[PDB]
Amino acid sequence: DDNSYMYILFVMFLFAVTVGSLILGYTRSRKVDKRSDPY
């Protein structure tokens, strides 16, 4: 295990990019009104 920190860092960093994109999508969301659509 010479450079074995690299694998952990890389997989965790891809997961971080994906989760960060999810959070940007939810924050940059527009409204949170639950039941106001068909009325």
Binding site: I8, L9, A16, V19, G20, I23, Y26, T27
Partner: protein, 331 residues
């Protein structure tokens, strides 16, 4: 009431360029912590995980132990639950049942280890990835696309598991007593031949178990093609199902935009007709300016509520049909 509701909108269903920072940064701290935790098992980088990591864990559970109570106290700004007895159904929300388990179980494990102990911190440090993705907006997509497509998924999993149960028994009958090139027997039991079935039905092909007798290779060929198809099916099924549900949310999200701009035109056109009757005279001399002024803004908003559609070239079945009725209607 202002403060509690503000704190709710901030910690749950959050919005605004700074809420992003807060939440994603808590998540990045969780990620650094889990990275150091998984590097504490390399046997050569284990010196990096000193006791300051443990105290950075106890200040982390100190932070979450008041974070949960802040989100509990800021829950009474909801019509679904009020007070203290109503707020128990706020703690039926499974992200909060996950979060409570995380904070209390990690606190309990940290208490007994401070008076296999450090190993329990890894699971309750992996679990803190799930609780910062709020609103459950991802699992609600998958749990509905699977439910819409329940028939085809149940069908192909039944056919694939029937082919796996059947044809990974004929291999065991063809390979019950046969040795490897290195002196061991691969298909010793049925479970070895079934490990093989799952592995070769999902096209992994590790290579620990290959059938050696020439009867078993034929069965492996047949079952390979005729069940690799039925196990590769749900990728295409859910691939259509995910791209068809987001387009069914970008219909109703545009239809939720169209309605207040189809209200702001009619409610303003009635205002523009009501110029007869709302010194009381020169005050009415000014309102005829504004009722014609904002009406054009509402007119621009209504034409911006239908002309930008979304995949915006979807008029390609009814190109001339929207005009060929209206010009007939004018005659």
């Amino acid at each position: 009431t202002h403060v509690q509701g503000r704190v709710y909108n901030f910690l749950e269903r959050p919005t605004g360029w700074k809420c992003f920072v807060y939440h994603f940064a808590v998540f990045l701290i969780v990620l650094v912590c889990l990275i150091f935790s998984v590097l504490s098992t390399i046997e050569q980088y284990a010196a990096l995980a000193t006791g300051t990591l443990f105290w950075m864990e106890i200040v982390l559970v100190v932070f979450f132990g008041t974070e949960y109570v802040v989100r509990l106290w800021s829950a009474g700004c909801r019509s679904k639950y009020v007070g203290l007895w109503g707020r128990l159904r706020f703690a039926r929300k499974p992200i909060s049942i996950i979060d409570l388990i995380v904070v209390v179980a990690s606190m309990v494990v940290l208490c007994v280890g401070s008076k296999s102990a450090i190993r329990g911190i890894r699971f309750l440090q992996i679990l803190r990835m799930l609780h910062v993705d709020r609103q459950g907006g991802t699992w609600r997509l998958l749990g509905s696309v699977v439910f819409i497509h329940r028939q085809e998924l149940i069908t192909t999993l039944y056919i694939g598991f029937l082919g796996l149960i059947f044809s990974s028994y004929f291999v065991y009958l063809a390979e019950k007593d046969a040795v490897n090139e290195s002196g061991r027997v691969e298909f010793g039991s049925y479970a070895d031949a079934l490990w093989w079935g799952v592995v070769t039905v999902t096209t992994i092909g590790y290579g620990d178990k290959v059938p050696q007798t020439w009867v078993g290779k034929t069965i492996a060929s047949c079952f390979s093609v005729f069940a690799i198809s039925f196990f590769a099916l749900p990728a295409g099924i859910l691939g259509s199902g995910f791209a068809l549900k987001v387009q069914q949310k970008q219909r109703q999200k545009h239809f939720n935009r169209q309605i207040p701009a189809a209200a702001s035109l009619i409610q303003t056109a009635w205002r523009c007709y009501a110029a007869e009757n709302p010194l009381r005279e020169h005050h009415r001399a000014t309102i005829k300016v504004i009722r014609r002024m904002q009406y054009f803004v509402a007119k621009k908003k209504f034409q911006q509520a239908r002309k930008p559609y979304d995949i915006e070239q979807y008029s390609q079945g009814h190109l001339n049909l929207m005009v060929r009725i209206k010009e007939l209607q004018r005659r």
